[PDB]
Structure formats: structure tokens, C-alpha cells
Symmetry: C2
Subunit: 95 residues, 2 copies
């Protein structure tokens, strides 16, 4: 019924840091997004649990890649934004 989803286009501005939850493997990275040249540069911390998408990132995607990310958004209340990745399309890969 209710949901909060977000589409993000920008450059991967960090490395792919692997983690393991207290239970499960997941990945974390950051996306730098600047819609207007005269405007604010936005940063988003992405979380990836889907293993087929984790393998595609750590293997083929490099830092500085232009990506289109769709993520489910959650706001944990002092609020913290959570962006669990659901799909990604590589527009241009990093150097």
C-alpha cells in the first residue's frame, strides 16, 4: 500500500565497502548527484542486499561511474535515511 522509492542518477563517489550484518552480506557506497551547475551537490549512502547486484558492482563497476539507481527509501527516527538498492543501470563506468 504505502511506499517510498527513489530514483538517483549520479557518480559513484566512494569505494564498494563490504559488510556483514549480525544475522547476512551487504554492500555500501555513496552517490554524488548535482542536478544544476549553480546548485547543490547531493550525496546518498546506498545499501545493497541483492547478491546478483553486489557481484555486478564489486566486479565491473569502478569508482566514478555514472549510474541510474532505483532504491526503496526508509526514514528511521534524529532521522536517518536508508536507501536499499533494487536495480542499477551503468550509464558510464569510472576510469
Amino acid at each position: 500500500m504505502d511506499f517510498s522509492k527513489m530514483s538517483i542518477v549520479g557518480r559513484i563517489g566512494s569505494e564498494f565497502t563490504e559488510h556483514t550484518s549480525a544475522n547476512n552480506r551487504y554492500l555500501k557506497y555513496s552517490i554524488a548527484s548535482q542536478p544544476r551547475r549553480d546548485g547543490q551537490t547531493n550525496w546518498y549512502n546506498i545499501t545493497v542486499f541483492n547478491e546478483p547486484q553486489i557481484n555486478f558492482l564489486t566486479e565491473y563497476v569502478r569508482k566514478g561511474a555514472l549510474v541510474y539507481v532505483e532504491a526503496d527509501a526508509a526514514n528511521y527516527v534524529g532521522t536517518t535515511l536508508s536507501l536499499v538498492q533494487k536495480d542499477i543501470n551503468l550509464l558510464k563506468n569510472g576510469k
Copy 2:
């Protein structure tokens, strides 16, 4: 071209406080699970007048908002671009 669009379906769980307009959306995807709260900023006055004079608290709405997250910790900003009333409060 970079962007960060947010799509929310939830219940307006606050009053419309004027400063531009500001309110909160209660988005609970699961009956058992957590409720997500999003502070919505509205600068579009044609949509400001629609919110105050037609929408009541607790109404189910679908909102498209642009997201901006500044790093200092981060600060999330959601500027409503368009809204559709699903069921009024």
C-alpha cells in the same frame, strides 16, 4: 544529468504549518512494520492553496518530490513537485 526524485504514498500525519508550507507524511509499507516519516517542503503556491483549502490531516496522498541531501551527517530535503489526493482525511 543528475537528479534524485522521490515518490511517496502515505498519510498526512501533521498540520499544514506556514513559514512556504511544511508538513509530514506517515508512510507505513507494512501493517506490522516501521512507519516512515518524511518532512515535505512546498514552495509551489498553487499547490500550497490546494493543500490548506482542500486536504485534511490523515489524508492518503501520493507525492512526487525532488530530494536534496547535503553533507556537513546529512540533511534530507523533499520539495513537493506534484501531488494527487487518494483519499481525504
